[PDB]
Amino acid sequence: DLPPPEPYVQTTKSYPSKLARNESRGSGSGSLFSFLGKKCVTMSSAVVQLYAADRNCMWSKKCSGVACLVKDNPQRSYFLRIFDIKDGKLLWEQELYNNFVYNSPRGYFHTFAGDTCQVALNFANEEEAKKFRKAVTDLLGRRQ
């Protein structure tokens, strides 16, 4: 069955890539939105269903589609976004943060911290989920 929904509470969020600071690992600046500078590379793609631990402890799908893990080589950051298969548009987007970890108490169901609410992701295939965590870890392992 699906994993149990955990209570998620806000804390603190801060990205180095969104700090405009000289090289990641820092905190200080006041850069603006941007203008022209984006170079992210994709790793793998796996279809999953985005769910939110609704009240009464009951996951609630928000929007499913094709999800791919993007990694910024130049920016030195990772971003997770989902695209629709009918609208072919962004249905979900997460801005990974420093010391990022991947939870997977299930076979093919990983959970993470949402904006202000808890959300979980469920892949369409098990392998795709296995390769997913393996990919992340592999990336986390490589670091630098």
CSV table of N, CA and C in Angstrom, one decimal, residues 46-98:
chain,number,residue,atom,x,y,z
A,46,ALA,N,10.9,9.9,-15.8
A,46,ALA,CA,10.1,8.9,-15.3
A,46,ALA,C,8.7,9.5,-15.0
A,47,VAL,N,7.7,8.8,-15.5
A,47,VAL,CA,6.3,9.3,-15.2
A,47,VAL,C,5.9,8.9,-13.8
A,48,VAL,N,5.4,9.9,-13.1
A,48,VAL,CA,5.0,9.7,-11.7
A,48,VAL,C,3.7,10.6,-11.4
A,49,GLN,N,3.1,10.2,-10.3
A,49,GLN,CA,1.9,11.0,-9.9
A,49,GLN,C,2.1,11.8,-8.6
A,50,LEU,N,1.9,13.1,-8.7
A,50,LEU,CA,2.1,14.0,-7.6
A,50,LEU,C,0.9,13.9,-6.7
A,51,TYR,N,1.2,13.6,-5.4
A,51,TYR,CA,0.1,13.5,-4.4
A,51,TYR,C,0.4,14.3,-3.2
A,52,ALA,N,-0.7,14.7,-2.5
A,52,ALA,CA,-0.5,15.6,-1.4
A,52,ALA,C,-1.3,14.9,-0.2
A,53,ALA,N,-0.6,14.7,0.9
A,53,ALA,CA,-1.1,14.1,2.1
A,53,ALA,C,-2.3,15.0,2.6
A,54,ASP,N,-3.5,14.8,2.0
A,54,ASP,CA,-4.7,15.5,2.4
A,54,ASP,C,-5.1,15.1,3.8
A,55,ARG,N,-6.0,15.9,4.3
A,55,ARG,CA,-6.4,15.7,5.7
A,55,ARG,C,-6.9,14.3,5.8
A,56,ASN,N,-7.3,13.9,7.1
A,56,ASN,CA,-7.8,12.6,7.4
A,56,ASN,C,-6.8,11.6,6.9
A,57,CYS,N,-5.5,12.0,6.7
A,57,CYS,CA,-4.4,11.2,6.3
A,57,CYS,C,-4.9,10.5,5.0
A,58,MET,N,-4.8,11.1,3.9
A,58,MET,CA,-5.2,10.6,2.6
A,58,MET,C,-4.6,11.3,1.4
A,59,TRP,N,-3.6,10.7,0.8
A,59,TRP,CA,-2.9,11.3,-0.3
A,59,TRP,C,-4.0,11.7,-1.3
A,60,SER,N,-3.6,12.8,-2.0
A,60,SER,CA,-4.5,13.4,-3.0
A,60,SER,C,-3.7,13.9,-4.2
A,61,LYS,N,-3.9,13.1,-5.3
A,61,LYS,CA,-3.2,13.5,-6.5
A,61,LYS,C,-3.6,14.9,-6.9
A,62,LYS,N,-2.6,15.6,-7.5
A,62,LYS,CA,-2.8,17.0,-7.9
A,62,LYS,C,-2.7,17.1,-9.4
A,63,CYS,N,-1.7,16.3,-9.9
A,63,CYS,CA,-1.5,16.3,-11.4
A,63,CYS,C,-0.3,15.4,-11.7
A,64,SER,N,-0.6,14.4,-12.6
A,64,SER,CA,0.4,13.5,-13.0
A,64,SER,C,0.9,13.8,-14.4
A,65,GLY,N,2.0,13.1,-14.8
A,65,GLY,CA,2.6,13.3,-16.1
A,65,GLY,C,4.0,12.8,-16.1
A,66,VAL,N,4.8,13.3,-17.1
A,66,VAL,CA,6.1,12.9,-17.2
A,66,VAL,C,7.0,13.8,-16.4
A,67,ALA,N,7.8,13.1,-15.5
A,67,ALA,CA,8.7,13.8,-14.7
A,67,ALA,C,10.2,13.5,-15.0
A,68,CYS,N,11.0,14.5,-15.0
A,68,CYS,CA,12.4,14.3,-15.3
A,68,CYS,C,13.3,15.1,-14.3
A,69,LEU,N,14.4,14.5,-14.0
A,69,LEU,CA,15.3,15.2,-13.0
A,69,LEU,C,16.4,16.0,-13.8
A,70,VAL,N,16.3,17.3,-13.6
A,70,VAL,CA,17.2,18.2,-14.2
A,70,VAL,C,18.3,18.6,-13.3
A,71,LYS,N,19.5,18.8,-13.8
A,71,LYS,CA,20.7,19.1,-13.0
A,71,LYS,C,21.4,20.3,-13.7
A,72,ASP,N,21.8,21.3,-12.9
A,72,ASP,CA,22.5,22.4,-13.5
A,72,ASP,C,24.0,22.2,-13.2
A,73,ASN,N,24.7,22.1,-14.3
A,73,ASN,CA,26.2,21.9,-14.2
A,73,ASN,C,26.8,23.2,-14.0
A,74,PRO,N,26.4,24.3,-14.8
A,74,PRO,CA,26.9,25.6,-14.7
A,74,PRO,C,26.4,26.3,-13.4
A,75,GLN,N,25.1,26.1,-13.2
A,75,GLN,CA,24.5,26.7,-12.0
A,75,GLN,C,24.9,26.0,-10.7
A,76,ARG,N,25.1,24.7,-10.9
A,76,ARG,CA,25.5,23.8,-9.8
A,76,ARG,C,24.3,23.6,-8.9
A,77,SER,N,23.2,23.2,-9.4
A,77,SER,CA,22.0,23.0,-8.7
A,77,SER,C,21.1,21.9,-9.4
A,78,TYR,N,20.1,21.4,-8.6
A,78,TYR,CA,19.2,20.4,-9.2
A,78,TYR,C,17.7,20.9,-9.0
A,79,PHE,N,16.9,20.7,-10.0
A,79,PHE,CA,15.5,21.1,-10.0
A,79,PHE,C,14.7,19.9,-10.5
A,80,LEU,N,13.6,19.7,-9.8
A,80,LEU,CA,12.6,18.7,-10.2
A,80,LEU,C,11.3,19.3,-10.6
A,81,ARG,N,11.0,19.0,-11.9
A,81,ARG,CA,9.7,19.5,-12.5
A,81,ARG,C,9.0,18.4,-13.2
A,82,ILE,N,7.6,18.6,-13.2
A,82,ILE,CA,6.8,17.6,-13.9
A,82,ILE,C,6.0,18.3,-15.0
A,83,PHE,N,5.8,17.6,-16.1
A,83,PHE,CA,5.1,18.1,-17.3
A,83,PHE,C,3.9,17.2,-17.6
A,84,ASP,N,2.9,17.9,-18.1
A,84,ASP,CA,1.7,17.2,-18.4
A,84,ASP,C,1.9,16.4,-19.7
A,85,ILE,N,1.0,15.5,-20.0
A,85,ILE,CA,1.1,14.7,-21.2
A,85,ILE,C,0.0,15.1,-22.2
A,86,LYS,N,-0.9,15.9,-21.7
A,86,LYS,CA,-2.0,16.4,-22.5
A,86,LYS,C,-1.8,18.0,-22.7
A,87,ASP,N,-1.4,18.6,-21.6
A,87,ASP,CA,-1.2,20.1,-21.7
A,87,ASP,C,0.3,20.3,-22.0
A,88,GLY,N,1.1,19.3,-21.8
A,88,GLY,CA,2.5,19.4,-22.1
A,88,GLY,C,3.1,20.7,-21.5
A,89,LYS,N,2.6,20.9,-20.2
A,89,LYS,CA,3.1,22.1,-19.5
A,89,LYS,C,3.5,21.7,-18.1
A,90,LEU,N,4.1,22.6,-17.4
A,90,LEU,CA,4.6,22.3,-16.0
A,90,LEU,C,3.3,22.2,-15.1
A,91,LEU,N,3.3,21.0,-14.4
A,91,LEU,CA,2.2,20.7,-13.5
A,91,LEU,C,2.7,20.8,-12.1
A,92,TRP,N,4.0,20.7,-11.9
A,92,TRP,CA,4.7,20.7,-10.6
A,92,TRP,C,6.1,21.1,-10.8
A,93,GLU,N,6.7,21.8,-9.8
A,93,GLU,CA,8.0,22.2,-9.8
A,93,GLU,C,8.6,22.4,-8.4
A,94,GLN,N,9.8,21.8,-8.2
A,94,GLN,CA,10.4,21.9,-6.9
A,94,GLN,C,11.8,22.4,-7.0
A,95,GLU,N,12.2,23.3,-6.1
A,95,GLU,CA,13.5,23.9,-6.2
A,95,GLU,C,14.4,23.2,-5.1
A,96,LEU,N,15.0,22.1,-5.4
A,96,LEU,CA,15.9,21.4,-4.5
A,96,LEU,C,16.7,22.4,-3.7
A,97,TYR,N,17.0,22.1,-2.4
A,97,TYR,CA,17.8,22.9,-1.5
A,97,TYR,C,19.0,22.2,-1.0
A,98,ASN,N,20.0,23.0,-0.6
A,98,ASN,CA,21.2,22.5,0.0
A,98,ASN,C,20.9,21.2,0.8
